[PDB]
Amino acid sequence: PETNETLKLIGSDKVQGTAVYGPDGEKIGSIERVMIEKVSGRVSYAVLSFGGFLGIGDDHYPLPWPALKYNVELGGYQVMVTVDQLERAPKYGPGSEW
Amino acid sequence: PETNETLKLIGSDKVQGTAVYGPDGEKIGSIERVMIEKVSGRVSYAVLSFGGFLGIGDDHYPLPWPALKYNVELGGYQVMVTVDQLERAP
Ligand SMILES: [Zn+2]
Ligand SMILES: [Zn+2]
Ligand SMILES: [Zn+2]
Ligand SMILES: [Zn+2]
Numbered sequence: 001p002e003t004n005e006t007l008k009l010i011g012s013d014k015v016q017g018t019a020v021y022g023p024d025g026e027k028i029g030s031i032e033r034v035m036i037e038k039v040s041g042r043v044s045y046a047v048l049s050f051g052g053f054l055g056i057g058d059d060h061y062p063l064p065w066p067a068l069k070y071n072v073e074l075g076g077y078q079v080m081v082t083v084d085q086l087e088r089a090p091k092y093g094p095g096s097e098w
Numbered sequence: 099p100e101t102n103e104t105l106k107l108i109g110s111d112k113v114q115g116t117a118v119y120g121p122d123g124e125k126i127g128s129i130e131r132v133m134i135e136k137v138s139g140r141v142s143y144a145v146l147s148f149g150g151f152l153g154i155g156d157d158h159y160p161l162p163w164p165a166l167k168y169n170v171e172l173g174g175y176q177v178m179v180t181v182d183q184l185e186r187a188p
Contacts, residue, residue, distance in 0.1 A: 001158075002130075002153055006133070008135060008136055008137070009133040009134065009135060009136060009142050010133070010134055010136050011131040011132070011133055011134075012110035012111075012113070012114060012131050012132045012133075012134060013110075013114060013130070013131040015110065015134070016110065016111060033102060033109040033110050033111040033112075034109070034110045034134070035104075035107040035108070035109055035110075036107060036108055036109070036110060036113065036132070036141060037106060037107060038106055038107060038108050038168075039106070040140070040163075041140060041141040041164070042138070042139055042140045042141070043139035043140070043141070044107055047109075055100055060099075065138075065139030066139070092099075093101065093104070095104060095106075
C-alpha cells in the first residue's frame with residue numbers, strides 16, 4: 001500500500017532519482033530533489049544533478065517544474081537543455097546575486 | 099555545495115524523514131513523501147507514516163501542506179491531529 005504515483009499526483013520519492021534526458025535522448029543525469037516553497041507548498045524548481053554522483057562531485061542545474069516532461073519511451077523526464085547551457089550551470093544556487 | 103534548505107525553500111529530500119509531533123509534543127510518525135500535482139507543481143498533501151515501520155506495516159495520514167508547522171524546539175513538524183483522527187485514517 002505505498003502508492004507513490006497516481007494519475008494526477010506524483011510522490012517526491014518517485015521524482016527523486018528519475019532519469020532526465022536531453023532533446024537527443026541522451027541521459028544527462030537525474031532529479032536529486034525538488035525545492036518547495038515553505039509557505040505555499042509549491043515547487044519552485046527541480047534540482048537536476050549531473051556529473052559525478054548524486055551528493056558527491058555533481059553539478060546542479062535548476063529546472064522549472066513545467067520543464068519536466070515525462071517521456072514514457074525513455075522512462076524519465078526529457079527537458080529542453082543544451083550542452084552549452086549545462087556548461088554554464090550556476091556555481092551557487094539561483095537565489096544568489098552572482 | 100549540497101544545500102537542501104534555504105530561508106524560503108525546503109528540499110523534498112529533507113521534508114522526507116522529518117519527524118511529526120502532535121499538539122502535546124509527542125512523536126506520531128514522520129513524513130514519508132509528499133504528493134505533488136503533476137500539472138501545477140503544488141504539493142497536494144504530505145504523507146504521514148505512523149505505526150509499524152516506514153513503508154512496511156505503517157499506516158498513512160494525509161496532511162495538507164499548510165497543516166505542517168515546523169517546530170524548532172521539537173525538531174520536526176507539529177500538527178493538530180488527535181489520536182481518534184489518526185485511528186480513522188483512510
Ligand atoms: Zn509516471
Ligand atoms: Zn547534488
Ligand atoms: Zn528547517
Ligand atoms: Zn508508508
